[PDB]
Design a protein around this ligand. Sequence first.
Ligand SMILES: CCCCCCCCCCCCCC(=O)SCCNC(=O)CCNC(=O)[C@H](O)C(C)(C)COP(=O)(O)OP(=O)(O)OC[C@H]1O[C@@H](n2cnc3c(N)ncnc32)[C@H](O)[C@@H]1OP(=O)(O)O
Ligand SMILES: Cc1c(CCOc2ccc3ccccc3c2-c2ccnc(N3CCNCC3)c2)c(C(=O)N2CCOCC2)nn1C
Ligand SMILES: [Cl-]
Ligand SMILES: [Cl-]
Ligand SMILES: [Cl-]
Ligand SMILES: [Cl-]
Ligand SMILES: [Cl-]
Length: 384
Amino acid sequence: DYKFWYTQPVPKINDEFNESVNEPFISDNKVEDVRKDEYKLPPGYSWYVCDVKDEKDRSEIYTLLTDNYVEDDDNIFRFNYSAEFLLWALTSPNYLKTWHIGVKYDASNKLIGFISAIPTDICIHKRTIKMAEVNFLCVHKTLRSKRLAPVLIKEITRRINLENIWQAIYTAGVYLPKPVSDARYYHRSINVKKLIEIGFSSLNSRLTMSRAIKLYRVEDTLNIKNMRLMKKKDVEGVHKLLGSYLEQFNLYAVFTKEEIAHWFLPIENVIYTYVNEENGKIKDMISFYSLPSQILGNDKYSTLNAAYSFYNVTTTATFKQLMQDAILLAKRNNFDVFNALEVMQNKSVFEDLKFGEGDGSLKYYLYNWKCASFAPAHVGIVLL
Ligand SMILES: CCCCCCCCCCCCCC(=O)SCCNC(=O)CCNC(=O)[C@H](O)C(C)(C)COP(=O)(O)OP(=O)(O)OC[C@H]1O[C@@H](n2cnc3c(N)ncnc32)[C@H](O)[C@@H]1OP(=O)(O)O
Ligand SMILES: Cc1c(CCOc2ccc3ccccc3c2-c2ccnc(N3CCNCC3)c2)c(C(=O)N2CCOCC2)nn1C
Ligand SMILES: [Cl-]
Ligand SMILES: [Cl-]
Ligand SMILES: [Cl-]
Ligand SMILES: [Cl-]
Ligand SMILES: [Cl-]
């Protein structure tokens, strides 16, 4: 019925809008009128602002998500964001500590709920808007189905409105009111043996074990000879390359020089970025971040090291050759699989590069904004 979401400024389930519609639901808001008090919690619980730059607070969030975050439809995987990943995803330029919200069970002083947001400039249908990017909403498994998630959402909505920000962007695998775009995800096997032993990939008389190994074997030779790890000196070249590339889409982020350095400069086991420099110009780039999935119950393996496509731009080669090199670069760094969405130009290389369609899709949502839905090929942003 969507009893909570019906009260929020988002499209009703049966709402559509014209291409030309591109405006908020509620405008002319005043920070002065925002609630100054925290939303009440049940007796025995208290809000807790998290300092992600502190190892203890950061480790408390890690344990919460490690034990209670998203699982697949078959209950064999659970996302296992590393502590360093969370530090990277939450300390972007001009972040606010007050947007890293948790809830504690006072008796044990244990964290049981969390939600976060970061500020980002988002362009939607040619209009650049200051928005909040929400992520990492989690409620402990022992307290599910107790209307705790709406409180987390309402509280962080208040903290964001207190900063004079009234729009937000988020994604989720579940269907809510209402997606502006819906993108199926795909996977590219690398460690064929491991993906079979754990039961993710299948075999049959046509595709045997040995035939499957040969099929997904990758050549260890880059199509772009000079693709190398990104460095500080490349920030400006990437800013120009990526900025120019994203203007062709209906939904993307507008990066500053500072944001480019944060979101792309490589970090081991977190973010990988490679670039090709010709005549002192950055002409091609590849990027993918690391998000392992704990293998639930398996006594042999503990995690499935997955790599997720981020932002890839080529001006001197074909997109086919580019994503092909991305897979190899992920293989060289000991990743078991390469995952991507059908956004930007990704869909044009899935068949040729032997991707496999997954079970579900990822929906893109906007808070307090009216605009027409569009195909995922017009989406030019990837959230963590
Ligand atoms: C301008 C600033 C605005 C800022 C805010 C903008 C909006 C932010 C939106 C959040 C961005 C998320 C970004 C990410 O990280 S997406 C992935 C979210 N995380 C997980 O799935 C981890 C594992 N699962 C859980 O932790 C819990 O099951 C969660 C927390 C998901 C719900 O807890 P629980 O299962 O214990 O239920 P409840 O009794 O509290 O309450 C049920 C209500 O919650 C609505 N629900 C369920 N799942 C989601 C979902 N993924 N996004 C939004 N709403 C969701 C549902 O429609 C229902 O509403 P209604 O059907 O009654 O109406
Ligand atoms: C929930 C889950 C799943 C379901 C598959 O999920 C995929 C697969 C591919 C995606 C590609 C791009 C973007 C999102 C992709 C997603 C996806 C789907 C739904 N939500 C999210 N996230 C939460 C919201 N913010 C972004 C991240 C990601 C698996 C799993 O089967 N594999 C993961 C490891 O590689 C092999 C297979 N393991 N686990 C813990
Ligand atoms: Cl239209
Ligand atoms: Cl090479
Ligand atoms: Cl191209
Ligand atoms: Cl398929
Ligand atoms: Cl469209």
